[PDB]
Amino acid sequence: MAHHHHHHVDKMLTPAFDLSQDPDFLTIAIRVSYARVSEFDVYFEGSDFKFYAKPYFLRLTLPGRIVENGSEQGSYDADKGIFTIRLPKETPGQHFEGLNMLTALL
Q: Are 47 and 61 in contact (CB under 8 A)?
A: yes
Alpha carbons 68 and 83: distance in angstroms, whole number: 19
Number of H helices, E strands in the chain: 0, 6
Domain coverage including residue 58: 1-106
Resolution (Å) of this entry = 2.4
Q: Are 83 and 40 in contact (CB under 8 A)?
A: yes
Q: Mind spelling out the 3-state secondary structure of 59-100?
A: EEEEEEEECCCCCCEEEEECCCCEEEEEEEECCCCCCCCCHH
Q: Are 56 and 77 in contact (CB under 8 A)?
A: no
Q: Are 83 and 29 in contact (CB under 8 A)?
A: yes
Identify the sign of the CA torsion 45, 25, 31, 35: positive
Candidates 59, 73, 43, 52; CA nearest to 102 is: 59
Q: Is 93 left (phi over 0), alpha (psi -120 to 50) or beta?
A: left
How many distinct structural domains can be found in the chain? Answer: 1
User: What CATH number is associated with residue 58?
Assistant: 2.60.40.790
